Amino acid sequence: YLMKILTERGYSFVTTAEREIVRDIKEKLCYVALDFENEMATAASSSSLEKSYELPDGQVITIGNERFRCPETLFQPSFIGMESAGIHETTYNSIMKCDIDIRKDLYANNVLSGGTTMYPGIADRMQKEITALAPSTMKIKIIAPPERKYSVWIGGSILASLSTFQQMWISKQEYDEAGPSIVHRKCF
């Protein structure tokens, strides 16, 4: 989507190699707006947002309100034509499907992980959205550790280092006896 909206200024990236350049632009410049309409209005009047970036050959480019419009797709998947609701509302729906007595704990211990949750300013936008959706009494807290990108791998290391887990591996003789369909069995 960023590669598609950059074409509104004149920069055309098409080759599968230039997708990497657009990815670098997204990583280094884009950020999630706290309030979308106010940012759209501000970027359309002033010019305090236009940040420039140097391509791998020169010819610097200037990104205007494409900065916070690219990652806004997360909270409004209608931008890329997807029907579903944003990541701010699928979390609330996932909570509401849970039982009525563990919703407070889930509200208080919302965890973020994965690479794409590294946008500057997402841990505040998501908290604001959920606080808008959730009942006013519950406390909404969003855990955003600085080591977000490698969180899954750190957890994997911790799990593999446990003594209690040492007998859950799928030993080779077990695979030889039941075939590849062993993974769906007790050894999950």
Binding site: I158, S161, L162, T164
Partner: protein, 52 residues
């Protein structure tokens, strides 16, 4: 009438004494905990949770 009043009061007083004896007897079971706080400004553990 005096005898009837005396016997009724004697029975009532005996029952009340039987109750009140144990009422005063084991009344310390009310001792429990209050769970105060100290702000725990001295916890500096490490990230090694493997026991869960």
């Amino acid at each position: 009438l005096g005898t009837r009043a005396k016997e009724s009061l004697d029975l009532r007083a005996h029952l009340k004494q039987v109750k009140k004896e144990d009422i005063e007897k084991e009344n310390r079971e009310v001792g429990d905990w209050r769970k105060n706080i100290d702000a725990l400004s001295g916890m500096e553990g490490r990230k090694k949770k493997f026991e869960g």
